[PDB]
């Protein structure tokens, strides 16, 4: 039994690891820096990502970012075992990537369904924030009929029990025991940003949006600040679509409502002489 | 076995859970409880165990340093798998107690051992995923307290398809356990908890909030939830400041996975031990300054040194920070101890920036503004419990400032109703409420420092104070010291004040590096202050905790005749409501001066400073034509 | 504190079982309804108001006389021993003090015998204290901040048990009986004692009881009981010991410094162990970060200078390389982070190094300093 | 085995003799004559009559009190047959009560005694006690006396039985709310509230604001992760030393009694003899009288302090709070008409709307100390007018109206 292989993803990861081993190796120095300082997330400049293969590597990574993420995660976390295996230890292999420095800064005014799944950066005034919470990034379960264990049970945007007991000697399904120790969790936070005053013409009204922050990038959002985010747009189920006019599709009955949200992996706020001077040509 | 537990085959949880390892460390623990090397003090733990059975309690406090000194890895396992170590330690303690007092299991189920003196402390803003399931020590303020309700501990189920009873399951307070397969039937049918064979516990949920003076600039107060179990309930009440050591775990599993995007949980702390303290190097350093001749003028000169003049106002700040003696006379009578101060005068006289200094100096300070504060937001608020759906109360600014100070800016400009609720706090030091079925009283022991403006924005020196402000005699009566400020014009006064301020902006302006720059800061403190500011904060704290000067009625004629004299001159003049409450300020402010010297006795000199400050206040707040006459009438004082 | 009442417990068959039970659990007990208590109260008033100490007596190497102290406090002390081999010629000058002393010694000597008979299993020393053979010290504070003291006797007697702390004692009508080090030492583990805290300016008279001081501390040791009391008096009064025992005071004072660095090393082991397990990596933390936590464990202020003393005694204790920030650090030397057997071995290693280095200093003919010099980390 | 428990109970009713009389047999016989199907058993007689059954009842009343109901029913019906329904058990006891804060997870299913004040009551509801059912598939009939209907027929598919309504029996039940005395509650704490349930003859005896003594069973029931709401099955509710009586009688015989007590009121303050004496009159209060038309004269003495600030007027109220056995202290600003007087709120435990008292309801039968009386709103004053001049509070909220007495 052989599963389908994504040849484009394999090509991307091969180009991804080759970029990591050749970029000058400041990023590996950052990798060693993370091992020294016990860090979780590595940060990569987009323009650094966009200066290999004339930037075509970034383009494929950008427009289909949500698809290709695991390949880059494998690409790096193989490198960490190659050069900093201690980061794999615990007291387990939590690892994150957070990009930044995008050229385009799209407005809340300019959200299109075409942008779903692509990498984009936006800017908006914060109005409300949520308290930080742990997010079940990856879970694991132990069987109920027998006592086999299932690891690396990823929860992609929903709660998901394992669909089978791996050993054919057992027939357990839809009945599992959740581990709270071998499992792993990650930080989580919601930010409610608002369209800037200079964007909305007179008479028009400000648009509002909810933005998700996870990892160490949480709590870098404070009310009243002009924050700037970087990430990808992802849709989530909605409950307020009921009662709207027009024919609504159905699943078969099951509902298929959606609403637009933006997920951000990096946080920064727009604002000592020599610090400012060197940033200009 | 022995010393074989140090082998690390896998993560610490993979090694402790092994029964052979468990027996080894359980055997290893049994030696520690019975014998410990405390030299002349013998094995105090045996005495601790023996006295606990005598006292009939479950609180075996265990010092971290003792176990860490004797048993290296046996203690370090408690810092990474505290739940596992505490599970077996209870059993080891249980048998140890029965050696001295057998049949302890007859009345007591378990020994809820308490860890103490744990050396690593984290704030509520430090907890991360890396510290999950560990043992953590935090300090905070009890804001909201829920009731006491039972919770399951060991759970047994009855199968619906057979009469058999399922085995016991420990309730982790993490998830409402729901089994899926019967042991006998192997069926997935219904199950119900067998209440007649289920062991409960006591559960109370308490909220801890950052200390008022520790909130970072420009952020809401971070706060967490704490789980008190096993007779750890009712250890603290609203307004108390506590430090607690517990386990940092996650238990909010439910609709959060769907009601909010993606599966997320929420964090709690399961408290193990809680506590609501000076080395020799501190007290010995205090007494050196204490023996310095004339210490009172050193403290007063150090009250916000970057403000020129206003010495008869800085003394009120100095006296209020130290406070008096909250004399609960014979129990049946009570008198407030803290000194209330009202700052009044023209704009441009630093009536507010001083209140931006009392906040940074007093141990616990809550700051408020006149129009930005509401009556409900100051005294107490009403909430519904998210777990038990009951009416609960949450403390306000005054409740937070218990054993501290409350700072109100622009006291006059607030609406009348918001100003009205303050009346009880300034005399009762308590909040009385009756709302939505809640009938109770809280503790609001806090001095109030208020800044205000006269009617029209300028002080009319030709009119009485009672006519210069929109307030009234009642509100003014609850104050002890009133600091009238005149912005009169004079070249000599202006030259001295301006040359002080122009130098203040020179120094407050920016310009082993830690040590070198910390030297520079205390160097500038020496330029302007006779006392280093860090010590003064501690010195005030030490005085408030240890010093309670007593009284001898030697100067009774001196004070009584002053009281009679002040009353006589206010019989027909628009002035302060000089009453018995105003006399008490003289004695209490005398206590502060005595408590500045760390003396235990109210000397004649202390009243001499006390009478001069109190009498001068009444003289200064008079019309011009009358002020010059009382200037000479009270020259004796 | 247990109370002994002569109205119901005054016979030897009554006192001995009671004293034995008290001393197996406690070190201090009270005497009630003594016939001389009423006279003692009158005698105390005469001493504290009329019979003031002879301030012109001076003070001697025998730690007897009227020693002037700080805050104009005077201490009138006398020592008496039956054995003439010790020259305690400076007998008590005031008869009212002797009146209290005789009354205390009248029943206290029998009680001192009771204390020895209660817990001391040595058959050779059952009657080590008696009328024929006894040694007593008369102590009297005087004023013309509690002081921690530990008498070296078998039993200590106070005519009034008030303002005495160990928790305070508020029983003026009962005499205080406290056991010293010698009874606990000769108890063979059956009884132990603890030091007390008293007001040094309360004008309180006190009495302590030994067998004749020429008796050795134990048959296992060469020094006599007088040597043990001499060491305590040298430690208690450095100004007196400066003229007569300069080197001895330096030797005795240096022992406390050794205990300082030993417990300091123990604290560093605990703190550094927690720091290793709290991180996924072994990078050494900077010293200034650890010091606030170190001082909390020590319950007193600890700075860089005290830490460097550990390096002088044991060079292989830690790795203290200076960080690129220019800040000192410290870390465990062992390549594998820690092992409970190696932790004890390294703790014993410092103990052996310090003890040998202590013996090296005391064996030197030069006069001895009472502190460990600090190590100098190689500057970069 | 359990027949001995029934037999021992039968001896304790038919044959137990006190004061040379069959008190339990006679009082049960008198109840039968009254047709009151209940018996008041005194626990102090039970311990003196048979300690062995007391051990079982005190420790495991799970089966004993079912035996109590069935044994008394058999014995009482035997008496009825001799002279010419299920009899409710009522327990009267004088044993020591456990503090409401002292209830823990150890007294589960144990009979406990409590004392407190009712703060809210519920409306009556009917609960089944005897049922008869019929199978819908085959008309098979049977009788049934928590209880759930059978899943299969005894002769039909799952759950084949339906209830025969005209041949079934039901009993009434009430839900009560109890909390500890606020005087016994230290400041900074809200008194703990406890849910109680009563049925049949024990219902509607107490209104909100009534101080009671409780004998009941401590237990829990599901309604947090596993936080079950505690509740009490009510078994019996009741609502000075000889030397103390002589001591206080001697106090009444003191020649300077009036002046001594007058001085005793706030001795820390000087003079003020007149205001002290009026407050003394406030402590005693007047004597109640009832008009022949049925109206009641208000016996409370209400006094207003209306003087200059700084005259210890606030301290005078505080001292009364510490001397009045029933004392409530509240400020004018931090009070509301709903907070002061009665209110209607829905109990989340039983999902029903309960009538709930307020501060002016808790202080019934005692003294309340209100401060800054001028600072409270007129609506609060208006509600006070009814309490002051009629000792009643009328509630009209949502869609329900009621009147509640308040002797404050
Ligand atoms: N006596 C003084 N010494 C130094 N600075 C002063 C003094 N009085 C006023 N100031 C300055 O004037 C300002 C007064 O601010 P504020 O306290 O708001 O005035 P107000 O008295 O109206 O509250 C402060 O910034 C302070 O620097
Ligand atoms: N006759 C008196 N004897 C003793 N203390 C008094 C007397 N009159 C007033 N006081 C003092 O007044 C204070 C109480 O005043 P209070 O009634 O609270 O003022 P207000 O009327 O503004 O509420 C107490 O601290 C008390 O010591
Ligand atoms: Zn399986
Ligand atoms: Zn089954
Ligand atoms: Zn049928």
Numbering used by the authors:
A (entry chain 6): 100 to 123, 134 to 200, 260 to 420, 445 to 463, 500 to 509
B (entry chain 2): 183 to 458, 475 to 709, 739 to 864
C (entry chain 8): 15 to 158, 186 to 207, 220 to 433
D (entry chain 5): 23 to 106, 133 to 193, 204 to 213, 236 to 303, 320 to 335, 349 to 517
Q: Which text from the study accompanies this structure?
A:
The MCM motor of the eukaryotic replicative helicase is loaded as a double hexamer onto DNA by the Origin Recognition Complex (ORC), Cdc6, and Cdt1. MCM is a ring-shaped helicase containing six related AAA+ ATPase polypeptides featuring bipartite active sites with catalytic residues contributed by neighbouring subunits.
To further understand the role of ATP hydrolysis in OCCM-to-SH transition, we assembled a DH loading reaction using MCM-Cdt1 bearing the Mcm5RA variant. 3D classification identified two distinct states of a complex containing ORC-Cdt1-MCM but lacking Cdc6 (OC1MMcm5RA). While all ORC subunits are visible, the two states differ in the configuration of Orc1. In conformer 2, solved to 3.4 Å resolution in the consensus structure (or 3.3 and 3.5 Å when locally refining ORC and MCM-Cdt1, respectively), only the WHD but not the ATPase domain of Orc1 is visible. As a result, only two ATP molecules could be built in the ORC complex (at the Orc5-Orc4 and Orc3-Orc5 interfaces). One new contact is formed by Mcm5 WHD (unstructured in OCCMMcm2RA) that engages Orc3 WHD.
